[PDB]
Paper text:
Endo-galactosaminidases are an underexplored family of enzymes involved in the degradation of galactosaminogalactan (GAG) and other galactosamine-containing cationic exopolysaccharides produced by fungi and bacteria. Whereas the fungal enzyme belongs to family GH114, the two bacterial enzymes do not lie in the current GH families but instead define a new family, GH191. The TIM-barrel core structure with fully conserved active-site residues and a negatively charged substrate crevice is conserved among all the families. The putative active-site residues (Asp156/Glu225 for TmGH191, Asp323/Glu391 for Env-GH191 and Asp157/Glu225 for FsGH114) overlap well with the experimentally verified nucleophile and general acid/base Asp189/Glu247 in Ega3, Asp196/Glu222 in Sph3 and Asp160/Glu223 in PelAH.
The fungal GH114 enzyme from the filamentous fungus F. solani, which shows a sequence identity of 33% to Ega3 from A. fumigatus, could also be produced in soluble form. For FsGH114 no activity was seen using the isolated Pel substrate and further studies are necessary to establish the exact substrate specificity of FsGH114. Similarly, within the GH114 family, F. solani GH114 overlaps with Ega3 (AfGH114) with an r.m.s.d. of 1.49 Å over 218 residues, with a sequence identity of 35%. FsGH114 also lacks the first and sixth α-helices but has a C-terminal extension folding into two strands forming a short antiparallel β-sheet. One of these tyrosines or both could play the same role as the tryptophans in the other three enzymes (Tyr121 is poorly defined in the present structure). The acceptor side of the substrate crevice in FsGH114 is flanked by two elongated loops comprising residues 164–168 between β4 and α4 and C-terminal to β6 residues 231–239. Thus, overall the crevice of FsGH114 is deeper and more pronounced compared with the bacterial GH191 enzymes, but also with Ega3. To gain better insight into the substrate interactions, we docked the substrate into Env-GH191 and FsGH114. In both cases up to seven subsites could be identified. Whereas the Env-GH191 binding crevice seem to better fit the galactosamine oligomer, the FsGH114 crevice can accommodate either an acetylated or a non-acetylated GAG oligomer equally well.
Numbering used by the authors: 31 to 317
Write the structure that this text describes.
Amino acid sequence: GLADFKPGVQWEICIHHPIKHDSAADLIPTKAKVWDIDMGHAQEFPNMIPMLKSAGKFVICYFNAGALQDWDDDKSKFPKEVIGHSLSYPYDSEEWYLDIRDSRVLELQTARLDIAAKIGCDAVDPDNVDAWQQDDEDPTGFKLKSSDYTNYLKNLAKYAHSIKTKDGQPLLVGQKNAPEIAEDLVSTLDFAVLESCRGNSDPNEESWPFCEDFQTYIDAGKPVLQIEYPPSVEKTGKVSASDNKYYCTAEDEDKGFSKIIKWASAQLDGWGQYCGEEPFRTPAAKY
C-alpha cells in the first residue's frame, strides 16, 4: 500500500538478519504495514519480497550509500581513491566511508538502485549520509561538507525518481539521520529514517536531540520512521522504567513520527517494541 505510506504508518525494520517469510503469519508484528529489510537479504531469499507484497506490505530496501562494506558483492568495482577512513579509524574494519562527491561512486550506487527496482522494493533507505567534517573532526578523510551529502542524495533521488518499481510507480528514497540538511532535502526525498532523535537517556552521552528537525517531513505528508535504542536493552535485554519514560512519553518534537524501539544500531534484528506494548520478535529465516 503506497496509499498507506504516509505519516503515522506502522512499521518494522530488520536488517541484521533476514526475516522469516514462509507464510504471512511469519510477518510479526502483523500490524506493521511498512517493512525495512536489507536489500541483500531480499536477493538471497527470493520469495521474501513476494511474500511481503502478497501480505499487502510496503517494502523499503536498506543499503549503505555512504560507506563500503567488506562483504559487498560489488566491492572490487570501487577504486581505492574513493575509499576513506574506516568507520573505526584509526583501526582497520569491515566498513569504510566513501567519497560521495565522486562520479564513480554515484554510478555504482545507481546500479544498486536498479537492483532495488528490479527485485520489488518500493523504496530505499540509504545509510551513512551524515559524515561531513564537523568542528575540525573529519570522519571520512575527504573533508566533505554537509552540502556534498545534500547534492549526493539529490543525485540518488533524481535517479530513483526516473525508474519504476515492480508495482509500477517511481522508486522512493529516504533521508537517514543528517538533521542539519533535512530542510534542504525535504522537497526532494520521500521520507526519513531516524536513529536516536530523542538523544540519549545518559545525559553524559554526546547526543543532541533532533526530532524537531524532521517535523518538516510530517508537514510535507512524508512519514518519519523513528528508531530509538534505549541503553537498557543492549545491557539487560529489557527497556527500563526510566528509559520507557525518556523515549516513550509524548512530546511535541516527535509528534506524528512512527516510533519503534530496537535493540542497538549494530543489532537491528527482529526484536522490537512499540510504546505502550510488550515487545515482539520478528523471526529469522535460516541459511
